[PDB]
Amino acid sequence: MTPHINAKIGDFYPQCLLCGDPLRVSYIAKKFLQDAKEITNVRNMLGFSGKYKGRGISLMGHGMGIASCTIYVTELIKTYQVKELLRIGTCGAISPKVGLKDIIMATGASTDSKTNRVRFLNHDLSATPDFELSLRAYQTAKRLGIDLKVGNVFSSDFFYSFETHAFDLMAKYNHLAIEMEAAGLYATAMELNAKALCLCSVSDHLITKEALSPKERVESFDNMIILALEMMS
Amino acid sequence: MTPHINAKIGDFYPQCLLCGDPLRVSYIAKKFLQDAKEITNVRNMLGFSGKYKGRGISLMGHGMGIASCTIYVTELIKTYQVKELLRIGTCGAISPKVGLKDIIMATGASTDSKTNRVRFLNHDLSATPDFELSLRAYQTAKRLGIDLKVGNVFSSDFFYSFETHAFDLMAKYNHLAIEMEAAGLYATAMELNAKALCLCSVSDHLITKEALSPKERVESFDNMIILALEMMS
Amino acid sequence: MTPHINAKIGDFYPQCLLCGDPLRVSYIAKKFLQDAKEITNVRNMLGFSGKYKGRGISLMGHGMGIASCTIYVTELIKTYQVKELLRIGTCGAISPKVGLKDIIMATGASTDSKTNRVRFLNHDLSATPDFELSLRAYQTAKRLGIDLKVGNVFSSDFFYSFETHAFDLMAKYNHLAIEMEAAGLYATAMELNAKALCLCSVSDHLITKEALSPKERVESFDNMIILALEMMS
Amino acid sequence: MTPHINAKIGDFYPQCLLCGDPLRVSYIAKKFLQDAKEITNVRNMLGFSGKYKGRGISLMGHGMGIASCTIYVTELIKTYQVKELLRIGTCGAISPKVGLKDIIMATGASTDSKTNRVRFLNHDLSATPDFELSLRAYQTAKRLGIDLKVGNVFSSDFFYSFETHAFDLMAKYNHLAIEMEAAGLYATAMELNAKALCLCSVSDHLITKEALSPKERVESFDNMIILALEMMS
Amino acid sequence: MTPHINAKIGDFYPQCLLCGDPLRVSYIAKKFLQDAKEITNVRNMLGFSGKYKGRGISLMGHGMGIASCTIYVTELIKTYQVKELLRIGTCGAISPKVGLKDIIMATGASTDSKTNRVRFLNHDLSATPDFELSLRAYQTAKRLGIDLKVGNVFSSDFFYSFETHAFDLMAKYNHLAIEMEAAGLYATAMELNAKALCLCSVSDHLITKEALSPKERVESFDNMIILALEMMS
Amino acid sequence: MTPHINAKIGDFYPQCLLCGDPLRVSYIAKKFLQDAKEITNVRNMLGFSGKYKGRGISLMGHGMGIASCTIYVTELIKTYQVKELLRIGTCGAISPKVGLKDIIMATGASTDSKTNRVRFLNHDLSATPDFELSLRAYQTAKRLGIDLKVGNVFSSDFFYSFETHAFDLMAKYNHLAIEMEAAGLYATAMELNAKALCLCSVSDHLITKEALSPKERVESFDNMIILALEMMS
Numbered sequence A, B, C, D, E, F: 001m002t003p004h005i006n007a008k009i010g011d012f013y014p015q016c017l018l019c020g021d022p023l024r025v026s027y028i029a030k031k032f033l034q035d036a037k038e039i040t041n042v043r044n045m046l047g048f049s050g051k052y053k054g055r056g057i058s059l060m061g062h063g064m065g066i067a068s069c070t071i072y073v074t075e076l077i078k079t080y081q082v083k084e085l086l087r088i089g090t091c092g093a094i095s096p097k098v099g100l101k102d103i104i105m106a107t108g109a110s111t112d113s114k115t116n117r118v119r120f121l122n123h124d125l126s127a128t129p130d131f132e133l134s135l136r137a138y139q140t141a142k143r144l145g146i147d148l149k150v151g152n153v154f155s156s157d158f159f160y161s162f163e164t165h166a167f168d169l170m171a172k173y174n175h176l177a178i179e180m181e182a183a184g185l186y187a188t189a190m191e192l193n194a195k196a197l198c199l200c201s202v203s204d205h206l207i208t209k210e211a212l213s214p215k216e217r218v219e220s221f222d223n224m225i226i227l228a229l230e231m232m233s
């Protein structure tokens, strides 16, 4: 076992979809998987194993923030032998290159965290996803007719930012959106030789203040779920 | 409502106990409170309001890590008008002065996070609790005959540490244990002029290699919980 | 001996009151102690041993700035076996919560120094006083009818600040006043397992530009001296 | 004209290959291009324009180190309207996954430079290439039967390193090799909204202690050069 | 008057010798100057004005550490119109090129302080003396037959060091000795457009373990003192 | 050999003049040296050995930026046994104390590079030239009737600065001009126990926007060349 997961070793398939919100994980298990079994529930952070088009797939919640994400991803890789980790979530757009309902593939994750300096010699770690996984996402999106937006995201320790004046500067350097875990997902997978990728759905635009209707939010997140499950099968 | 709490304004009493684990919050509501009502459940992060010896008290989960804690504490203060926040968490002992299941009161919370440098001019913010709450904790512990251990804690972005060499230095500087939220609780309550304190029970021990099960991390710490409820009565 | 103190080992009592100004130390020895003996005078930095209400008490000057304070405190603890160190001084108020003649108890000391990053793994050390000593100060102040103001102070390397625009931000985070040694006193005592506390008297308000009359400055500092000597006896 | 390029505006095609060594640039012009013309030679840093299979392609030297690279890339983009920049450099292998003369495509460029902290709010900029160019490189390599190694590189300010202990950690985090310009190329192209990619051939090997001669660093990498020209056709 | 000097404006000559120890300043006044008058004594930090071979020269103590030194130097320049400041201090040798009682002239002062990063855009300020004063020191030493050692010093916030491993690296980079004020003297005089130089005599030796008594640190360095007075005549 | 120099060991004289621009090195060899032999040309970075007034002197190009300069200087010292390195170049004035055509002697080199923090314990290295060499430059300039301007320079990683608002602050702290290599030259020579000095010619004033005519630029650089060759003979 671990302190944060009470699944049996072997309960997880080697491919795992992750979301910060464990109720979104539950929703995916119930709506999209066949024969879905809840396999962990410590701290109400739910994980499941089921089948998608006959393919075994696991789902796991990771909470909010780099430190929370790093706990679960570390345990999934080191204890539960998970090999491929696809994070899907929402993000707040900061770039004119993206709009509401877009799906972003993060080919880099910048951060205001100290975690990668602590990991990496007090230097600048370029936190990046597995290239083959990003290729698979691109080819699957084209097959599904999804216009995948590709660029960096900014992973913040702050949901309520003290640096909103800086969003334009991040957009200048090709940061399409802000979220709070990708840099930790990527650095952990890099450390532990696992394949990881982050996709995020634009439900809010932090510049133009636009926001999706609650029904639209379900629809756009559903399209992201289908993309994720298709690239893992 | 906030993006992470779906309570109505006014559902929270001005005094609130916090745990990272919403199931420890649920345990406390069911075991120790009268007329307890679940008031929020976004992302499965439960919160409750109820009575202890006729006094209204709220409970709220804050998830794992400074970024998660800061989100919930910020919303509790600014939207739900919470005035006193008492974290009753778990921690890993690094000092030979403390043992498994000891209760520590954090007179300061050091950190490897960048959040306080971002908050505070890139200088050293010494994150500290409210002194009146600390005095109340000390006096209540004396009244109840509880041996309260008092010192700093170190709040890390890492549970699985890359600086295991460094725990002895931490302990030398009177850090009794490591956990992952106190510095964020303290800095947020400082920012927002609210009263906060962190108590934690030792669930893991660097020196003895003891570690509690997930069930024990919920159920083994009634002495902490009773201390907290008695402080807020 | 040491390079900076020429007292005999054993000349110091285990409890020592400190001030930056050695002439203030001399004043205390002459006005408040019985049988006071000058025991060190290297670099004109005077220290004394005498009796207060039959209690042996030492006094020692520590100069200005964290680096100066750290030299004397290190020597007092390691060579002269001093166990409890109470620093009293003036400070410049930056918070609307305090006014001229207030006495502040510093339960944390933030800093713009690099000293604690050098001491503490390049992380954020929360520099804090000994809790039991702060309890003793609080109980003694209540016995004497002193309205003790409690909060953080900011210990600066700069008397003539280049960051005056930032005072409001420090006051927001519960820094009541600025001085130049507390963070070094606290970190040194933490390193060396000694008990330390800092009190400071508000003789100037850096925001409202108010300032005490020279006679008022003597009176307010006298009240602080009495509080200190009473808590050590 | 610019202080470092004496070409006429319009002399550069929109697609440009880059090497740190202007004599590798000269070699490519003479060996692989039709109707090649030298278009700039300030500071002996040569650049050319010519044709490959009827398609116009430019070549430009960028010197050694991030500061040198940033100068030339900034001018190529802002003054000479270059749109796509493909570095084909050399690097020192630090990972057992790669061997001498292997071709690496840098999916990210970590660094010990301060340039990106200066650019990017003192946070961590994850310096990354254009994804479309990366896909083009991958697909062209597959078409040509070239075994393209894919991972991060570490861009250092040092060729003769003071952190030789640290190469193993770099390699653990999937840094295949060390070189000295990719992070600057990537950050400058991000700043200026241009498409950039870095390929490098292994000219030195940490583990085997192999190292090529200066002549071999010009002449030994035709497979890299052909990959690059085929990508831009 | 200033908070730390109670001289009248005009009491200081434009040329001033500085020591950290006010009793070394007093020693110089009594032993080497004609008609010496004590002009300031706040906090027992003495200063004098007198004549050497008919030329007016002032002396002033600056206490221990960069923060203390910066206070006195700032006031001497801005209020008392001092133009040339010559520190004649003590230092701990870390290089085998120097021996006990050697006189070092600090061509640069490296530091572990944050003060210069705070002053200077968070970049590296290379703190250096006035070149004309350095030339004067060199030429006067030659004239007097004094073997002046020339190199960098390292100005630390610590006398009792936590980086004893690091002294050999310091010495490799031509740091002959460690002391605690030169970088602050140099940075303050740079800020304020005044001429400053630091000479120091070796009072402690890392390699031989030699260390002088407090009395010897006042009385053993007449050769330094005579060099300084001859330079300012 | 080395990767970046193809001269024979022994081809270099122990005294070497350096410039960033290898065509300026060529110009010096052709116009001012007797019997000049080109001895290296890797990457078109030319170096020469010849005679000046019967004195053997070498010349070597070092490219732009600290990282480039550090490669060549390291190789010159460690492989080719060069003992004295005099860098001459142009610089952009930022101080009212200097004007067009002035020659500056840099007695310190500040920087925005991370290189000296990486070299030097994450502290502040005061990067300084060899004092005897600076003496020789001063005495030679006086003999030649040159009004040598003496002060710090600022060595930047950025030719196209993002911090132009800060030039006035650097001028305040006695930075007379900006260039891009001196801090690296100085730190490398300090590490490796070689004698180094940087002179620079003011061809542009970055404040007043003044600029020398192309013919004046040749004349002023010629005067600097003569000063350099005279101090090495």
Ligand SMILES: Clc1nc(OCc2ccccc2)c2[nH]cnc2n1
Pocket (backbone or CB within 6 Å): B090, B091, B092, B093, B094, B156, B158, B159, B160, B161, B167, B178, B179, B180, B203, B204, B205, B206
């Ligand atoms: Cl960071 C952290 N680490 C824990 O245990 C692991 C550990 C134990 C000893 C030394 C260092 C780390 C915790 N147990 C409860 N909260 C915790 N937070």
Ligand SMILES: Clc1nc(OCc2ccccc2)c2[nH]cnc2n1
Pocket (backbone or CB within 6 Å): D090, D091, D092, D093, D094, D156, D158, D159, D160, D161, D167, D178, D179, D180, D203, D204, D205, D206
């Ligand atoms: Cl920084 C750098 N170092 C190289 O080789 C030296 C080396 C080899 C192995 C480990 C570390 C350093 C390079 N070869 C081509 N470009 C290079 N850039």
Ligand SMILES: Clc1nc(OCc2ccccc2)c2[nH]cnc2n1
Pocket (backbone or CB within 6 Å): E090, E091, E092, E093, E094, E156, E158, E159, E160, E161, E167, E178, E179, E180, E203, E204, E205, E206
């Ligand atoms: Cl920081 C300092 N340390 C001294 O001696 C202790 C020492 C000796 C050798 C290596 C390191 C530290 C001094 N003696 C006079 N001024 C001094 N400043």
Ligand SMILES: [Mg+2]
Pocket (backbone or CB within 6 Å): A019, A020, A021, A088, A089, A090
């Ligand atoms: Mg989400």
Ligand SMILES: [Mg+2]
Pocket (backbone or CB within 6 Å): C019, C020, C021, C088, C089, C090
């Ligand atoms: Mg005082």
Ligand SMILES: [Mg+2]
Pocket (backbone or CB within 6 Å): F019, F020, F021, F088, F089, F090
């Ligand atoms: Mg030049």
